[PDB]
Amino acid sequence: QVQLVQSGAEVKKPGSSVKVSCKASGGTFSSYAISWVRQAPGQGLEWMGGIIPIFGTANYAQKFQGRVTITADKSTSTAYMELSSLRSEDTAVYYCAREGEGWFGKPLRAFEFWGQGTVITVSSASTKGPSVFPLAPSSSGGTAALGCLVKDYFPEPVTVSWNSGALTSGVHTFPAVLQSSGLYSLSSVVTVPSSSLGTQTYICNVNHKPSNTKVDKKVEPKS
Amino acid sequence: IVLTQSPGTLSLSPGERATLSCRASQSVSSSYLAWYQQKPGQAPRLLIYGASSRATGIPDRFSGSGSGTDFTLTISRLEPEDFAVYYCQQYGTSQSTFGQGTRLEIKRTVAAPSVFIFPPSDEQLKSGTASVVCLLNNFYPREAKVQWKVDNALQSGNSQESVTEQDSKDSTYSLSSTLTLSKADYEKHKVYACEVTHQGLSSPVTKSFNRGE
Amino acid sequence: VTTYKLVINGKTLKGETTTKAVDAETAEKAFKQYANDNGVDGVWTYDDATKTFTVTEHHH
């Protein structure tokens, strides 16, 4: 069955170039268009271009003519996209999509199959593990809120759990925010009964794979 | 071509009928109009191709219609898994454009937020920066306003915020806002307050603390 | 160029993180800043066989 597997996330310096790969398995790789569609954080779908491998002819959105190159390698059923002189506005998820087939007569004229996406971050920042600060419950009717502030890391993503995954009810982990420093920042909060602050331990488990940070912060009530 | 979707947000209850609109600046052939569904963190999913044909595996409560410049996606009875972002697309070999997306959100009763404020921790103040966090928990609708005040002076340009997706259990939203100052600026003031405006509050709510106490 | 590791043994912060440096002295300077940024103050030890720093706060 048709499957598109894309290469992994990349951080790139501004002005450089990146090559993203999309390997297709389980279908003919020849007469069906492979396109590239990008999505900047919080924004819509934007078609970049596409190629019919058997003909080799690539088309591009006007916006990207001159710094994108889409190629296809029939020897490995892989499609490639090269984007050069990267700018910050090129931070996005890049999807590869393949046209579907008709029943007997053909082109679907729609993207039936999508890759899982490739996160491209364009930044001059260096890899940095997070700082984890407590958001301490104070002394909201019988309910207390606490959490962790996961600050000044790069790149995305970080994962947060509470008490090694045993605490899930009331948990809110917010989408990260990009600071003027170039570093990301996010908060995870949990709502708990005020009565439990004296008897339960609340530990936020922070994982940042790019820096191999695995770190556990005990959040205790301030007196 | 410019594809314009309406409305931008559609708030409906499960069981209701959703009608999504895609209008084109110029005529689009019916076999080139496709609809996609996208959920947070996932790739888009093909729903309708050729304006009216359901892709393999799409339940028959999804239907598409239209020709020329007016196209429509109808969902006859909203199941909870149908709340998502929807994109129309004009498929093309040499040029292809997407609509800007419609967000289909669950409508529920108004719920005022619970507001908490957290001072910067002692361990952060060791490092020369101070972060103040205001939490707005489980409110609906999504629109909320947060004003920071330092010694009753309105702040500006020194905060960032973000909002959760809509909760699957109770359909509410939560919001976190962080006000950032140097440690030196934080030591020069005493009252840190966060004032929340929202539809479920008959008047702005203020949560605050005095530095030190 | 060579990966160094930091194990954190604090009262409230426990775990590990890494960094890439040429020197053990360049890694030490990166780790000591990180530990201060997280408000950790403790006793420092180093094992060159494993390229691992350890910071341990008094009690836990």
Author numbering:
A (entry chain H): 1 to 52, 52A, 53 to 82, 82A, 82B, 82C, 83 to 100, 100A, ...
B (entry chain L): 2 to 27, 27A, 28 to 213
C (entry chain M): 5 to 64
Which passages does the manuscript contain on this structure?
MPER bnAbs show outstanding breadth, neutralizing up to >98% primary isolates, but have uncommon features. Notably, long heavy complementarity-determining region (CDR) H3 loops with aromatic residues at the tip facilitate bnAb binding to the hydrophobic MPER and nearby membrane. DNA sequencing revealed PGZL1 was from subclass IgG1, whereas most MPER bnAbs are IgG3s. Using X-ray crystallography and cryo-EM, we determined the orientation, angle of approach, and composition of the PGZL1-Env interaction.
We reverted the V-region of PGZL1 to the most homologous germline alleles, i.e., VH1-69*06, VK3-20*01, while leaving the CDR3s unchanged, thus creating PGZL1 gVmDmJ; in a second antibody PGZL1 gVgDgJ, putative reversions were also made to DH3-10*01 and JH3*01. The MPER671-683-bound (2.47 Å) and -unbound (2.6 Å) structures of inferred germline PGZL1 gVmDmJ notably differ in the conformation of their CDRs L1, L3, and H3. When superimposed, residues in CDRL3 in the unbound structure are shifted up to 6.8 Å from those in the bound complex. This shift of CDRL3 in the bound structure may arise from MPER binding, which cause a rearrangement in the aromatic interaction between Y32 (CDRL1) and Y91 (CDRL3). We note that Y32 has affinity matured in PGZL1 to alanine, which does not affect Y91’s orientation; thus, the CDRL3 and L1 conformations are similar in both unbound and bound PGZL1, and resemble the bound form of the inferred germline PGZL1 Fab. Using biolayer interferometry (BLI), PGZL1, PGZL1_gVmDmJ, and PGZL1_gVgDgJ bound with affinities (KD) ranging from 9.9 nM to 64.4 nM and 938 nM, respectively, mostly due to different off-rates. Hence, PGZL1 gVgDgJ binds to Env when detergent-extracted from membrane, but not on the cell surface, whereas PGZL1 gVmDmJ binds both solubilized and cell surface Env. Strikingly, PGZL1 gVmDmJ neutralized 12% of isolates at 50 μg/ml and 28% of viruses at 200 μg/ml in a dose-dependent manner.
